[PDB]
Amino acid sequence: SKVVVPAQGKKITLQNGKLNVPENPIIPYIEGDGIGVDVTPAMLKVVDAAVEKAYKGERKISWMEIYTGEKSTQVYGQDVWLPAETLDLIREYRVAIKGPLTTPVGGGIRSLNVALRQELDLYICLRPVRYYQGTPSPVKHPELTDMVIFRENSEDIYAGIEWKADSADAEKVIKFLREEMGVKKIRFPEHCGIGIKPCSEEGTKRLVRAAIEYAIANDRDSVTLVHKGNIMKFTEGAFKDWGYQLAREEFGGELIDGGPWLKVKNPNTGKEIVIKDVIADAFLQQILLRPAEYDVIACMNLNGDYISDALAAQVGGIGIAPGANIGDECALFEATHGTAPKYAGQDKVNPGSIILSAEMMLRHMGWTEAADLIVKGMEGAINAKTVTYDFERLMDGAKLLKCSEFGDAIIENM
Amino acid sequence: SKVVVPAQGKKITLQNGKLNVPENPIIPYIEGDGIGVDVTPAMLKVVDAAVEKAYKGERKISWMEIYTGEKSTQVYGQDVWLPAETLDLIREYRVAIKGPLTTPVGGGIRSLNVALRQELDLYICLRPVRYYQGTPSPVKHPELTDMVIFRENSEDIYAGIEWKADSADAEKVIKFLREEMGVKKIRFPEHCGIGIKPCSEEGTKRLVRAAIEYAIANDRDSVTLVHKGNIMKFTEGAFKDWGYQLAREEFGGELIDGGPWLKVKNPNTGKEIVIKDVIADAFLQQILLRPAEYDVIACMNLNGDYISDALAAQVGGIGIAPGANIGDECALFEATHGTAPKYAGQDKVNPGSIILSAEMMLRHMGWTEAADLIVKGMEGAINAKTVTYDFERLMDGAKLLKCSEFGDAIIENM
Numbered sequence: 001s002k003v004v005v006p007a008q009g010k011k012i013t014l015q016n017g018k019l020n021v022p023e024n025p026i027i028p029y030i031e032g033d034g035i036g037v038d039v040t041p042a043m044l045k046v047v048d049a050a051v052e053k054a055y056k057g058e059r060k061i062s063w064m065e066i067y068t069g070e071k072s073t074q075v076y077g078q079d080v081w082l083p084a085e086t087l088d089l090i091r092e093y094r095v096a097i098k099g100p101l102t103t104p105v106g107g108g109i110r111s112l113n114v115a116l117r118q119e120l121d122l123y124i125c126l127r128p129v130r131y132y133q134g135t136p137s138p139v140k141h142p143e144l145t146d147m148v149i150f151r152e153n154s155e156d157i158y159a160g161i162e163w164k165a166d167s168a169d170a171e172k173v174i175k176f177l178r179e180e181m182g183v184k185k186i187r188f189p190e191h192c193g194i195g196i197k198p199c200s201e202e203g204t205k206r207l208v209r210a211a212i213e214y215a216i217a218n219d220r221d222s223v224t225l226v227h228k229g230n231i232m233k234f235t236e237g238a239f240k241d242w243g244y245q246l247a248r249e250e251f252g253g254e255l256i257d258g259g260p261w262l263k264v265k266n267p268n269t270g271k272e273i274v275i276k277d278v279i280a281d282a283f284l285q286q287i288l289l290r291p292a293e294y295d296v297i298a299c300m301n302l303n304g305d306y307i308s309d310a311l312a313a314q315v316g317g318i319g320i321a322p323g324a325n326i327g328d329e330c331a332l333f334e335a336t337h338g339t340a341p342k343y344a345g346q347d348k349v350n351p352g353s354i355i356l357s358a359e360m361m362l363r364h365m366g367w368t369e370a371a372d373l374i375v376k377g378m379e380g381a382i383n384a385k386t387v388t389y390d391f392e393r394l395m396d397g398a399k400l401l402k403c404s405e406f407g408d409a410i411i412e413n414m
Numbered sequence: 415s416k417v418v419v420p421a422q423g424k425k426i427t428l429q430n431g432k433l434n435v436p437e438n439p440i441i442p443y444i445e446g447d448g449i450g451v452d453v454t455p456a457m458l459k460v461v462d463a464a465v466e467k468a469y470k471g472e473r474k475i476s477w478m479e480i481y482t483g484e485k486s487t488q489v490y491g492q493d494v495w496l497p498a499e500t501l502d503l504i505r506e507y508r509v510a511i512k513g514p515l516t517t518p519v520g521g522g523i524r525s526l527n528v529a530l531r532q533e534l535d536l537y538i539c540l541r542p543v544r545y546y547q548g549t550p551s552p553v554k555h556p557e558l559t560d561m562v563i564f565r566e567n568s569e570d571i572y573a574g575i576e577w578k579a580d581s582a583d584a585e586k587v588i589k590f591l592r593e594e595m596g597v598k599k600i601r602f603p604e605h606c607g608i609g610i611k612p613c614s615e616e617g618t619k620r621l622v623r624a625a626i627e628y629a630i631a632n633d634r635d636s637v638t639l640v641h642k643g644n645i646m647k648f649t650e651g652a653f654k655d656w657g658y659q660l661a662r663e664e665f666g667g668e669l670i671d672g673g674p675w676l677k678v679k680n681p682n683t684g685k686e687i688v689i690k691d692v693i694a695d696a697f698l699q700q701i702l703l704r705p706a707e708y709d710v711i712a713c714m715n716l717n718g719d720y721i722s723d724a725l726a727a728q729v730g731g732i733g734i735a736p737g738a739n740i741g742d743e744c745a746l747f748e749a750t751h752g753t754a755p756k757y758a759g760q761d762k763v764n765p766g767s768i769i770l771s772a773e774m775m776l777r778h779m780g781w782t783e784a785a786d787l788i789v790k791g792m793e794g795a796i797n798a799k800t801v802t803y804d805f806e807r808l809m810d811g812a813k814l815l816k817c818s819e820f821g822d823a824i825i826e827n828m
């Protein structure tokens with residue numbers, strides 16, 4: 001009802017598991033709450049400039065704004081935080097992007113970001129993390145970090161199945177667990193909240209499958225399965241076992257030494273990709289102490305959350321970390337940082353995150369030239385130390401830029 | 415049957431919620447698997463030296479070795495990994511300490527470390543983390559880190575309640591969830607593992623209670639409740655709500671500004687202790703970017719695992735991180751790092767972790783003088799760069815020492 005489909009522009013379609021993108025594709029976008037009002041306009045201009053430069057005017061995106069979050073309430077009404085139309089529009093146009101999102105509290109509403117991911121079944125949470133020269137970082141050698149996180153995005157405790165303490169449902173579940181399943185490990189059964197942790201084999205192998213194919217298509221060195229399987233054997237541990245099994249079953253994985261590591265040969269470059277695994281808590285230590293040993297990462301939903309945020313912070317890219325939610329039919333790229341209401345509307349915020357997510361979007365669309373130009377632009381702008389306040393306040397000799405001005409700096413460095 | 419109670423020596427007792435420790439207390443200790451054979455003898459000698467120096471020979475510990483893990487199998491038999499006697503002996507002597515521990519794989523045995531914690535109901539996992547000058551660290555300013563982690567140690571998914579995919583029990587649980595609880599969020603119900611996440615109110619407030627009393631007795635600046643309550647509202651979020659409520663209920667917590675932070679006045683120093691909270695994933699970023707803003711931390715079992723390991727790695731103390739498991743009746747201090755079988759028996763390993771855990775043990779025993787001397791010793795030895803290979807290999811100008819030699823260096827610096 002309130003969305004306006006672009007007069008000029010054409011729908012992207014999916015054929016043969018492959019995207020068919022017109023030169024004039026219509027792309028849905030969500031402004032985002034808080035600073036989304038600052039970063040998204042900058043993102044629109046940077047992407048258009050990259051597309052214009054790369055294809056000489058032969059291609060052009062027809063942006064179409066759709067709504068979710070606060071602006072949705074103001075467009076559709078009181079408690080319309082996520083209109084069904086938004087979901088239909090992302091399905092119909094295949095690819096879309098959105099800015100910061102905030103969930104309401106006090107109304108029993110669960111995460112809108114997760115709702116998008118689960119109802120569009122974007123089971124892949126892709127977070128590429130690497131260091132941009134010139135970025136202020138808390139660690140000594142952030143350049144050693146160059147990883148690609150494949151976060152399972154549909155299942156685990158992150159899936160929102162739980163019951164409140166003292167509620168009739170929670171006591172019912174606890175009764176079933178203690179009396180019918182013989183559970184004795186619940187230390188305090190009364191006044192106790194209960195949550196469910198699911199992890200299936202199909203969900204695990206389509207995620208790991210995507211991670212290995214990514215390592216192959218991008219010639220990466222290895223794929224590490226991160227889990228907490230020594231404590232959670234049937235979910236975390238199963239994820240790791242199913243991951244190795246997939247590698248053996250579909251990619252000719254061979255045993256390295258006496259195991260458990262495997263090696264998969266890259267069908268295109270002949271490189272032997274190492275398949276290995278590391279327990280999650282020790283991994284949070286290894287990304288700091290031996291970051292160069294890791295590359296592509298495959299893990300569950302919650303651990304992926306933790307890992308991606310920790311890696312982003314160590315390379316100083318907490319506000320420029322790109323992110324994408326991908327499934328077999330649809331794809332939603334997104335800022336990954338918060339709404340930042342206290343600077344919203346001041347044209348202060350750092351647009352690097354949503355812009356790099358737009359870079360991932362264009363590359364996903366096959367427009368690798370334009371995506372390359374955006375990376376080049378971020379490269380030069382940050383290296384030139386012409387950046388926003390979140391960077392500049394942590395360093396010396398930098399030129400402070402507004403959010404919009406930083407967008408121009410990126411374009412200038414393309 | 416194979417343990418030998420010290421001829422000379424007396425049992426520690428608990429009276430009025432307060433430990434009564436004799437000058438000649440008997441202390442049970444577990445050597446530990448792998449490098450435990452290297453670090454524990456060094457720990458024994460360092461503690462004895464600190465006790466001898468601090469009380470002029472008037473006090474002395476009567477060590478008593480008890481077994482768990484591989485040595486237990488070789489002492490008690492084939493699959494005796496954790497003899498009931500060990501548990502009885504820790505109960506009877508109140509305080510004990512143990513080296514690295516490894517769980518068997520392939521026999522359906524769950525974590526021995528967790529088994530100890532849950533059957534002795536040591537619901538407090540205490541991990542003090544701060545930087546020792548001279549320690550090689552991956553971050554720029556490790557000195558800014560000075561935190562005390564209070565990890566809930568008895569409940570959460572860490573409690574081992576789960577069922578294997580395709581097993582009759584898992585399908586039974588899934589059937590109950592879908593058909594009797596109306597669960598629709600399990601993406602793939604078949605071939606799916608299931609785990610249970612419990613979190614009670616009593617378990618939460620006795621843990622947070624201990625953290626606040628610790629902030630009071632040690633005059634710390636604040637207590638931060640770390641959780642992932644925006645996704646797991648009834649466990650993680652409940653933990654955070656119950657934490658604030660406890661602070662209000664028992665420590666006169668007052669609202670700061672418009673909330674949610676609270677302030678508790680230290681009854682002994684008048685200092686206003688800040689009670690606040692931070693979402694777990696963002697917290698893993700904050701410990702790196704703004705470490706000086708945090709002090710005492712209160713959180714659930716799994717997050718505590720992650721947080722303590724990440725903090726230990728950033729201050730370069732992955733092998734010297736002290737740790738303790740404390741309950742209302744018993745206490746078990748422990749190395750916190752792995753078994754390191756590939757250097758076991760070579761007198762290479764770093765004994766700093768179990769020694770600092772022994773320092774926590776002595777202080778818990780009221781022997782603060784002796785504990786102070788151990789900290790002093792670690793202080794000087796590390797600052798003097800006379801350390802073991804794990805430190806020395808990451809730095810220049812250091813004097814390489816064997817594990818035992820490092821123990822002597824600590825004594826020499828008391």
Ligand SMILES: NC(=O)c1ccc[n+]([C@@H]2O[C@H](COP(=O)([O-])OP(=O)(O)OC[C@H]3O[C@@H](n4cnc5c(O)ncnc54)[C@H](OP(=O)(O)O)[C@@H]3O)[C@@H](O)[C@H]2O)c1
Binds near residue numbers: 336339341
């Ligand atoms: N991908 C997303 O769309 C996304 C992700 C995460 C959260 N959020 C949402 O946003 C809402 C806003 O509220 P909050 O203020 O309590 O957020 P918050 O806890 O996420 O704050 C993140 C902090 O990072 C900094 N920051 C974030 N984005 C930045 C940018 O672009 N440039 C510079 N600094 C940036 C600000 O810290 P300082 O610079 O002040 O230190 C900021 O307040 C949250 O409720 C959350 O629902 C959206």
Ligand SMILES: NC(=O)c1ccc[n+]([C@@H]2O[C@H](COP(=O)([O-])OP(=O)(O)OC[C@H]3O[C@@H](n4cnc5c(O)ncnc54)[C@H](OP(=O)(O)O)[C@@H]3O)[C@@H](O)[C@H]2O)c1
Binds near residue numbers: 751
């Ligand atoms: N608190 C405990 O008692 C405790 C804790 C955690 C694990 N463990 C147990 O130990 C077993 C041993 O097997 P793993 O070798 O596969 O272990 P692992 O994955 O824990 O290895 C930890 C790594 O840290 C280093 N390290 C650990 N302790 C060290 C010390 O004291 N000094 C110097 N470096 C040290 C070694 O790495 P590099 O120096 O080689 O890089 C080491 O292999 C594990 O199965 C686990 O059950 C015991």
Ligand SMILES: [Mg+2]
Binds near residue numbers: 306
């Ligand atoms: Mg996250």
Ligand SMILES: [Mg+2]
Binds near residue numbers: 719720723
């Ligand atoms: Mg741990």
